[PDB]
Amino acid sequence: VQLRESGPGLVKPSETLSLSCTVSQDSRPSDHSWTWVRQSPGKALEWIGDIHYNGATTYNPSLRSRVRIELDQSIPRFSLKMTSMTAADTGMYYCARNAIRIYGVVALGEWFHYGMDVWGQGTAVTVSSASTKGPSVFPLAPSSKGTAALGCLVKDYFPEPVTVSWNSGALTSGVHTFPAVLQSSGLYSLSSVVTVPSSSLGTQTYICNVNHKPSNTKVDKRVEPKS
Amino acid sequence: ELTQPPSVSVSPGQTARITCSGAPLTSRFTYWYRQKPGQAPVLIISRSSQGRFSASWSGTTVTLTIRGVQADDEADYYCQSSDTSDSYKMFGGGTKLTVLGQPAAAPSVTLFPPSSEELQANKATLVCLISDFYPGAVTVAWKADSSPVKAGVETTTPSKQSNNKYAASSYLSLTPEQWKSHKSYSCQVTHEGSTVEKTVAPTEC
Amino acid sequence: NDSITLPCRIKQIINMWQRIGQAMYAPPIQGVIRCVSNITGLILTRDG
């Protein structure tokens, strides 16, 4: 069972927002209430609504004038169409699923709201009018002399977030990616550190893989050593 | 909204309570979720029928029982419940469980000079990164040679790592003209009255 | 393919047959109950 998301990543003011949450690999999908939840940077979680397969779409009192949850059960996927997007709506957005467990009969109420046991990994929805920028990466070549360390600098990108891993996805054990700084200009910048030793530093060709999720500009830049 | 305490901490091994309270609890069940800073929240209390967690009902409230806490549980616990009309579901204010007396981890600092390419693209963004410290409180300064820097320094804030400690970054935005101009660049980071300084140059390597 | 249903209330005491003077209690029924039948007739009315 795997929830998967798809959407923009940056939103214009007074403009229309729409997000998708597809369902690959699932044996019991049409039985539940499919939901959406969001969160301001490091703040709390707020509930938008659910759509059961049957078209009974539940919602939230305030967003009554903004939203509508569609269902294209052909995949199946469920879609949210929201209007009047403002900078105050900036934050994390996770699709989810409120489970509905039953014993036999529906209309005689032998089911119950099981819970939002599944969610998405998250896609930021930062509302602005600035420009999205493909990242510019820069080698932080390693120390020459065993153990050493190194990293890679990613500068001038917008908006959040950039996520990476090294060696086509082969290093997530003793790894450190560091926060991004929306520079005074208005562009973020971060770096990512990998704990590489000193011995193989003569025959390899290590690559560093970057994903600026909102810009659709993935990079393979060889981080060549320190002459 | 549903009522939670802002924080209940406790010493390792003992029991910490985290309660929910509100208007639907006299007729509806109470669900629970735990989020580490920026992580996806972790469901713990489920609507079973008609291993270190438990939530206890009592009239207009439901009390969680975290018996024997650890550093892995230092996060935010949000309670959740359905409405009595069931027309909505809602969350609580977030209880930050803190594990008391966790060891005071010193800072670990890494300083890099600008790359071969960035100095050709007319930027010199020095990279001074900090890892594996506790608690969330670091004070950083910048020195050019032995003379501090005023304008060009931006920094982020402590973020919890994979090991329940915090990490952060620091950058200095200079031109390629101001990076070979001096003689050295030094990053200096205080932590609970303890610091370290790293020295690079445009002539060493 | 499927089925439909109607919600039914479980009543044990009753004063049927308009035998003015006698109501009574039907003892509990151990185990799950089921009962099938060919539906056959109907009683109804009309307006004016």
Side-chain angles (χ1 to χ4, degrees):
Chain A
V1 185
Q2 298 169 4
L3 279 196
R4 292 297 182 262
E5 284 186 301
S6 171
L10 177 79
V11 168
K12 285 185 178 178
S14 82
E15 293 277 315
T16 302
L17 164 69
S18 187
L19 299 176
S20 176
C21 178
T22 65
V23 183
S24 178
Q25 310 177 18
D26 191 0
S27 72
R28 304 178 179 191
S30 55
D31 320 349
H32 310 288
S33 298
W34 293 87
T35 66
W36 302 87
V37 173
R38 76 175 190 174
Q39 169 185 45
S40 281
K43 307 279 188 176
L45 320 160
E46 291 194 338
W47 175 86
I48 292 184
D50 64 60
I51 179 168
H52 188 280
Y53 173 94
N54 57 25
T57 297
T58 322
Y59 51 96
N60 182 283
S62 60
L63 299 181
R64 67 188 189 280
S65 56
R66 299 175 72 176
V67 304
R68 161 76 174 183
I69 313 180
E70 256 299 332
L71 170 75
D72 195 337
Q73 63 275 13
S74 64
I75 301 307
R77 69 173 180 92
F78 64 115
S79 170
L80 175 59
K81 185 179 178 182
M82 181 186 294
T83 59
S84 284
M85 292 296 302
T86 66
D89 298 306
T90 294
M92 302 282 299
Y93 285 66
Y94 319 81
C95 70
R97 192 278 304 275
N98 192 337
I100 300 292
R101 182 177 181 180
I102 196 188
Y103 292 129
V105 168
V106 174
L108 265 74
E110 287 123 35
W111 62 274
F112 43 87
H113 283 104
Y114 191 92
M116 290 173 291
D117 46 337
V118 195
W119 41 81
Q121 298 302 322
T123 300
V125 175
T126 302
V127 182
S128 173
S129 60
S131 176
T132 298
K133 179 55 185 180
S136 186
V137 303
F138 297 106
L140 301 178
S143 179
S144 60
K145 184 172 175 59
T147 53
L150 76 160
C152 188
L153 166 68
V154 182
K155 194 176 180 297
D156 288 7
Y157 81 83
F158 191 89
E160 275 304 273
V162 165
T163 55
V164 305
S165 68
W166 300 260
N167 297 344
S168 310
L171 291 175
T172 50
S173 177
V175 296
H176 328 283
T177 290
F178 287 85
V181 46
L182 188 57
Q183 303 176 77
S184 60
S185 62
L187 298 176
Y188 280 97
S189 179
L190 54 72
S191 56
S192 304
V193 163
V194 57
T195 58
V196 173
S198 173
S199 65
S200 58
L201 298 170
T203 61
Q204 298 284 312
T205 307
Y206 290 132
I207 62 177
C208 190
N209 288 116
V210 173
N211 181 13
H212 187 196
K213 182 177 174 181
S215 71
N216 199 43
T217 305
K218 308 172 183 179
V219 180
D220 185 344
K221 174 66 176 184
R222 185 165 70 180
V223 178
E224 289 183 12
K226 198 161 66 173
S227 175
Chain B
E1 295 183 350
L2 285 181
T3 300
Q4 279 190 241
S7 170
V8 170
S9 70
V10 77
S11 178
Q14 290 307 310
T15 301
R17 288 84 172 176
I18 306 185
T19 79
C20 198
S21 182
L25 271 60
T26 57
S27 297
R28 281 307 179 275
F29 180 70
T30 303
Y31 319 71
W32 285 91
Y33 306 83
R34 170 199 85 179
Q35 180 192 33
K36 292 185 179 184
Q39 284 278 312
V42 184
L43 161 70
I44 51 177
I45 295 300
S46 166
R47 174 73 177 268
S48 175
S49 184
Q50 289 179 308
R52 299 286 193 272
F53 48 79
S54 145
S56 171
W57 191 72
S58 185
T60 60
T61 181
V62 172
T63 294
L64 187 71
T65 300
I66 308 183
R67 174 181 175 180
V69 311
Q70 59 179 351
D72 269 358
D73 288 324
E74 192 205 297
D76 289 357
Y77 291 70
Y78 308 81
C79 72
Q80 190 265 309
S81 178
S82 62
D83 188 66
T84 49
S85 77
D86 291 311
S87 58
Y88 66 83
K89 296 87 176 181
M90 49 178 173
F91 281 95
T95 300
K96 188 180 306 304
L97 169 63
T98 300
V99 186
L100 297 182
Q102 288 182 253
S108 162
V109 170
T110 306
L111 174 58
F112 273 107
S115 67
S116 171
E117 283 194 357
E118 196 200 18
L119 299 171
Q120 299 158 340
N122 293 324
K123 292 297 174 183
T125 312
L126 284 69
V127 183
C128 182
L129 313 178
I130 310 94
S131 69
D132 304 308
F133 68 84
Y134 193 97
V138 284
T139 304
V140 185
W142 275 90
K143 284 193 296 183
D145 314 327
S146 62
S147 179
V149 176
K150 297 296 183 178
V153 175
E154 301 166 330
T155 186
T156 62
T157 55
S159 175
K160 181 172 295 179
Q161 300 179 204
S162 59
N163 51 24
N164 301 309
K165 294 183 186 180
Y166 288 82
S169 65
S170 179
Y171 303 92
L172 165 60
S173 179
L174 298 170
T175 70
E177 307 162 344
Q178 292 291 315
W179 186 81
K180 284 191 67 179
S181 176
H182 304 69
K183 293 299 174 186
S184 66
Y185 282 106
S186 296
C187 191
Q188 186 180 7
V189 175
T190 286
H191 182 83
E192 279 193 349
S194 178
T195 182
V196 62
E197 185 179 334
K198 300 286 188 178
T199 295
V200 299
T203 65
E204 305 179 14
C205 200
Chain C
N1 298 334
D2 48 355
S3 62
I4 59 175
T5 180
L6 283 189
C8 312
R9 314 188 180 277
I10 309 167
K11 185 169 185 176
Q12 291 180 311
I13 302 183
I14 199 169
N15 184 1
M16 204 66 107
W17 300 112
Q18 302 304 286
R19 183 63 181 93
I20 301 175
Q22 189 52 224
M24 51 85 53
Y25 167 70
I29 307 302
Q30 169 77 229
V32 174
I33 296 178
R34 66 173 177 88
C35 189
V36 297
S37 188
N38 302 308
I39 293 174
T40 310
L42 176 61
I43 309 170
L44 73 160
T45 182
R46 65 162 300 276
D47 58 18

